[PDB]
Each structure stands twice: as structure tokens, then as C-alpha cells.
Design a protein around this ligand. Sequence first.
Ligand SMILES: [Zn+2]
Ligand SMILES: [Zn+2]
Ligand SMILES: [Zn+2]
Length: 82
Amino acid sequence: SFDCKICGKSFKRSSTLSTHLLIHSDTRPYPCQYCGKRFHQKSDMKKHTFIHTGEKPHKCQVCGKAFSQSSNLITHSRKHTG
DNA sequence: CATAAATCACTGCCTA
DNA sequence: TAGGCAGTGATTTATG
Ligand SMILES: [Zn+2]
Ligand SMILES: [Zn+2]
Ligand SMILES: [Zn+2]
């Protein structure tokens, strides 16, 4: 596995370490197009741009609510589940 | 404990 | 053992 030589954590994928090394190098080449925030992962920014635009492609067919992130849908569905 | 938004970290595909 | 790209999930922060 790839272990970070800064804080001291491991990554099964060199890429997970890459983004992680980016946490130390603070590399955020994905700048919000509106409130200028900065992210280090396109889709995470795109999910940001959507919190603007108002896009929520994850529709819960349980209580008619919609979400930008699936994780937020998954957890949201987890509440419906039990 | 729950919501809306934030940030991190795992995943599938490819080569010397 | 090393490095990128695109898709997805689990986690935590800030607030009520
Ligand atoms: Zn580290
Ligand atoms: Zn923004
Ligand atoms: Zn719902």
C-alpha cells in the first residue's frame, strides 16, 4: 500500500494517496464558478456548482426529496430504511 | 439526532 | 512500487 510520508496514514490506491498528498500540498485546481470556493476534485466541485445552479440529480422516491450527492442520498435513504 | 453543505477517501481501468 | 482520470460512498463540519 502507499503510505503518506507527512502525517502518517495509508492508501490502498496511489490515487487515494495522491489526493491525500494534495491535502498536505493543499492543491485545489477546481475553483467554484460562483462563490469562488476551491476544491481538489472536479465532481466534488461540480456537486458544488450544482448547490448553486440548484441541480439535485439524486431523487429519493420515498419522500419526494432530492440531493446533489448520492452519499447524502444514501444516508437520506438509510433514514427511510431504518 | 437530523438537515444542508463541506471534505475526505474508496473505487474501476491502464502501463513500465 | 509509482501516477492519472472519472464514478461513488462514508465521513465530518456548521447549524438547528
Ligand atoms: Zn498525510
Ligand atoms: Zn460556489
Ligand atoms: Zn426521502
